[PDB]
Amino acid sequence: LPAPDDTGLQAVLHTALSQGAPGAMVRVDDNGTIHQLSEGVADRATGRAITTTDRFRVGSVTKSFSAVVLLQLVDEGKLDLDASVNTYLPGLLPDDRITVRQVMSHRSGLYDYTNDMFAQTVPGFESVRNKVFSYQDLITLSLKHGVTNAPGAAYSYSNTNFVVAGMLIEKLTGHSVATEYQNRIFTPLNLTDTFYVHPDTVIPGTHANGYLTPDEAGGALVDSTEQTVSWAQSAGAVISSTQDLDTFFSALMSGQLMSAAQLAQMQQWTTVNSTQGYGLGLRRRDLSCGISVYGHTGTVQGYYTYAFASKDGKRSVTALANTSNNVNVLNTMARTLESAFCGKP
Known part of the structure; x- marks a missing residue:
């Protein structure tokens, strides 16, 4: 690999601040040499600076944790990727043809209930932030809508799929998803900054605050740090750090978290767009310098x-x-992958 480009990383973070991120940061583990940069504030009201050790909500990166658990259950003989979801959760879905593999790759057609929840960004956050949902509640909200495509037929990202994933993990293990994450992933990798505390709203330890950008241009930011994330659960509620997510995806890709057979299943790519794929709870992004990288995004x-x-x-x-709901920042932050993997242009 090319050398990571710290000057380029510095410029990406500075640009993200100029576009409305209160703080921005990045950590690279380059085969045992660390790169770490941060700019701006963890708390914009107190002025406390952001740092690469601050914990944060990883959002949909949670799906990779859920997928690892499920693929270990496949290694143990408890789960068949090509069986119907309804085989394990009878009567859950209106169509027996929807399989576990299709859910985990966003090919199931299940409508994403969060499109109803966040049609207005800040009001929808205000509606869900302090709510506790069961898994079944979220499934029911999805099933108010027809499926969007035939089973297996189309890629369509949907949080509902990884609500199903959490339901499967709990049903087949008899344990909470928190227990399964802790025993199968957090403890074995010593991820000391990584938690699943749902429905608690506190982020344990020193953390970056989150600032939701309103839909109105120029509107005041909303502190969105403390929420249950019950609307996402096994689709979105993990808390972690840059060091721990680096440890987790390194362990995953180097073959430490499941059999070779199940990692290969996880990397069977469904096309997302001309530079991206989706596996089983895993994203592929193709970078400008001809390198692909593997992991997940979160919002x-x-x-x-x-x-x-x-x-x-x-x-x-x-x-x-x-911040979130700021597409300039989102697009800018993607450039960290270019500078870190492709290096100086």
């Missing part, structure tokens, strides 16, 4: 995450901006 109110590693796990990068 939860007030937090944008990128967490990706090289194919062999030897270089991993996690970047965080503590």
Whole structure:
């Protein structure tokens, strides 16, 4: 790999601040040499500076944790990727043809209930932030809508799929998803900054605050730090750090978290767009210099995450901006992958 470009990383973070991120940061683990940069504030009202050790909400990166659990259940003989979801959760879905593999790759057609929840950004956040939902509640909200495509037929990202994932994990193990994450992932990798505390609203330890950008241009930011994330659960509620997400995706890609057979299943790519794929709870992004990287993005109110590693796990990068609903920031923060993996142009 090219050398990571810290001057380029510095410029990406500075640009994200200029576009409305209160703080932005990035950590690279380059085969045992660390790169770490941060600019701006964790708390914009107190002025406390952001740093790469601050914990944050990783949003949809949670799907990779859920997928790892499910693929270990496949290794143990408890789950068949090509069985019907309804085989394990009878009567859950209106169509028996929807399979576990299709849910985990966003090919199930299940409508994403969060499109109803966040049609207005700040009002929808205000509606859900202090609510507790069961898994079944969220499924029911999805099933108010028809499926969007035939089983397996189309890629369509949907949080509902990883609500199903959490339901499967709990049904087949008899344990909470928190227990399964802790025993199968957090403890074995010593992820000391990583938690699943749902429905608690507190972020344990020193953390970046999240700042939700309102839909109105120029509108005042909303502190969105403390929420249940019950609307997402196994689709979105993990808390972590840049070091821990680097450790997790390095371990995943280097073959430490499941059998070779199940990692290969996880990396069977469904096309997302001309430079991206989706596996089983896993994203592929193709970079300008001809390198692909593997991991996941997250968007939860007030937090944008990128967490990706090289194919062999030897270089991993996690970047965080503590805003959301700001597409300029989102697009800028993607450039951290270019500077970290492709290096100086």
